[PDB]
Design a binder for this molecule. Structure first.
Ligand SMILES: CC(=O)N[C@@H]1[C@@H](O)[C@H](O)[C@@H](CO)O[C@@H]1O
Ligand SMILES: CC(=O)N[C@@H]1[C@@H](O)[C@H](O)[C@@H](CO)O[C@@H]1O
Ligand SMILES: CC(=O)N[C@@H]1[C@@H](O)[C@H](O)[C@@H](CO)O[C@@H]1O
Ligand SMILES: CC(=O)N[C@@H]1[C@@H](O)[C@H](O)[C@@H](CO)O[C@@H]1O
Lengths: 47, 47, 47, 47, 48
């Protein structure tokens, strides 16, 4: 459904695997902060 | 039932995914601490 | 009978979810250290 | 397929377990960055 | 269940892992020849 992995890098950046893709970005600060919309895609498949 | 993810950011904040929602807050100090009630909701759905 | 989550806080404390309860304590240093018996309960239920 | 574990060390190295094998490397920086292709194999079996 | 159950770092850079209900720690492996479970410190036996 949602994320397969969700975890932090030691610099404070949030990482997530969603639909076999890897994303990173600063963690959301409120429910009005759409994280996936602004996260950087860093893995297109295989995760 | 319980949490899907439960993990720390490097600044010491506890993060958790519960019923597809993302929460954060200082970790509970004791079993008198209703963490889910006081945690900040930072994502509603999709986690 | 085992743990659902087992992870570190950035200050070096070990956290664990066991039997729906959340526990914390310094990590064990030898197999003679019964960690769960000495760990601090910081959440009863919902984890 | 996919990863079983995917997590950071405090020095910023990404680690991953894929098909019983353990890999490490600097995290991928764009969707053109094939992480598993350049990651260092540090465990063949047992993970 | 197969392989490890948990595999994760402490903030001082030590690798921890749960394997066959036992908890192990050690410096992370350095190559595909490094037999980690043979050299890792057993710090918990049962219940993990
Ligand atoms: C996985 C993800 O980025 N989810 C967010 C959700 O948390 C947030 O509340 C919503 C606001 O419209 O946007 C997205 O759905
Ligand atoms: C997930 C969560 O926040 N659980 C807590 C539990 O840890 C705590 O013991 C109780 C106190 O009344 O409140 C909540 O149930
Ligand atoms: C879990 C574990 O320690 N696995 C290692 C494996 O990574 C390594 O390639 C092999 C070398 O002989 O020894 C062990 O099987
Ligand atoms: C989860 C937990 O605390 N397990 C410990 C185990 O690690 C240790 O080897 C044993 C004997 O001291 O006591 C407990 O079973």
């Amino acid at each position: 459904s949602g994320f397969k992995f969700l975890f932090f890098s030691p610099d404070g950046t949030l990482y997530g695997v969603h639909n076999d893709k890897l994303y990173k970005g600063t963690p959301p600060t409120s429910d009005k902060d759409n994280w996936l919309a602004r996260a950087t895609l860093i893995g297109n498949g295989g995760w």
